Symmetry: C2
Subunit: 151 residues, 2 copies
């Protein structure tokens, strides 16, 4: 039996999202055609995991974004962007986007992606909240209510 | 701006899920370039929704399943085994095993797929609720627990 990592889900065509993967998730993960990983945490990759990371033709992109509770938060627009930069590179797919619980951090990048994809904030924030389950932040959504685009 | 249908989500490559499509979503539906769609409600497709179907060359397979509440649920193994067949024919992808809300019925088959795909009742169940929410039901999941994967 295969075990998708926590809060696992398929973002767009060739993109994946999940809370935070581990050993029990390797088999399943070792099938998505993972060419790279988008890890949104300012902590080192767990050895057991990292072993898999390397010996799999999987590149790691770690845009460390400090994670603080809702009482008082703050999302790194820049870091997310550097991630939204890589994520948008077709050559990088298939990629798995992930942080800790895969709800907030992984929420902005995917949420923003959707924005650039021309979704309505309404249907957008819905997808955002569909995952957050227990805890679901408002600040992270507003951060997106105002995500300006270059192009 | 684009508006995905109710509880839209990309199940896997080619496969999608959601609730009863509303005109306010079509623009988005064209994005998917759907080839086929699996229907689970017995009521006949409306006027608009059907116009789009033809106006967009999308094949519709219907497998009307009754819609009851938690107290007395009951899914037709037959009408599920079949739709699961349609879903398994690459020729059909794109798809959308949608029903009226995209919570139970949709999730049932979308779950049974995961069963075939050699997932895990639990990792399968957590996905199921990620669409039913405060309206999740044991009945359905039980169906899944039972459903045989001996093709």
């Amino acid at each position: 039996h295969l075990i998708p990592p926590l809060n696992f889900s398929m973002v767009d065509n060739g993109i994946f999202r999940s809370g935070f993967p581990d050993s029990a998730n390797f088999s399943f993960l070792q099938t998505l055609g993972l060419r790279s990983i988008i890890y949104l945490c300012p902590e080192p990759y767990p050895e057991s995991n990292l072993q898999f990371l390397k010996s799999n033709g999987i590149r790691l992109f770690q845009f460390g974004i400090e994670g603080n509770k809702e009482p008082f938060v703050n999302i790194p627009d820049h870091k997310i962007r550097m991630a939204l930069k890589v994520l948008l590179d077709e050559k990088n797919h298939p990629v798995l986007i992930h942080c800790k619980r895969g709800k907030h951090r992984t929420g902005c990048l995917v949420g923003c992606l959707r924005k650039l994809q021309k979704w309505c904030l309404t249907s957008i924030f819905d997808e955002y909240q569909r995952f957050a389950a227990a805890k679901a932040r408002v600040s992270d959504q507003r951060f997106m209510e105002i995500f300006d685009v270059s192009s």
